[PDB]
Design a protein around this nucleic acid. Structure first.
Length: 114
RNA sequence: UUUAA
């Protein structure tokens, strides 16, 4: 087809939306955190993980039945190098009567022995 | 002690 007008930018700035929502980086750049106390939150686990690299997204899990924290969360990086560093940086971290567990997100690349 | 809420 022929050329056409670009109709200009949608907002001349950041895209408007009802939420910032979650998003992920490349493979191996995603991270998990568990054993968190209830004082954690999406911004709190974010500030805990931002010095390890550029975090694209961060969230602490919540129960829709009680609105209490599920004591674990999810985080993601723009590269796997900052992700694997953040595992060795927060895994085994003592808080309260427990130590924080940290791990990579599940993937179909690991769902098989091949 | 764990994978979208």
């Amino acid at each position: 087809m022929g050329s056409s007008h670009h109709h200009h930018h949608h907002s001349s700035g950041l895209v408007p939306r009802g939420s910032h929502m979650q998003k992920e980086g490349p493979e191996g750049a995603n991270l998990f955190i568990y054993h968190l106390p209830q004082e954690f939150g999406d911004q709190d686990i974010l500030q805990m993980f931002m010095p390890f690299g550029n975090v694209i997204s961060a969230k602490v899990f919540i129960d829709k039945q009680t609105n209490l924290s599920k004591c674990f969360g999810f985080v993601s990086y723009d590269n796997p190098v900052s992700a694997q560093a953040a595992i060795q940086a927060m895994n085994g971290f003592q808080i309260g009567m427990k130590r924080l567990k940290v791990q990579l997100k599940r993937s179909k690349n690991d769902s098989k022995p091949w």
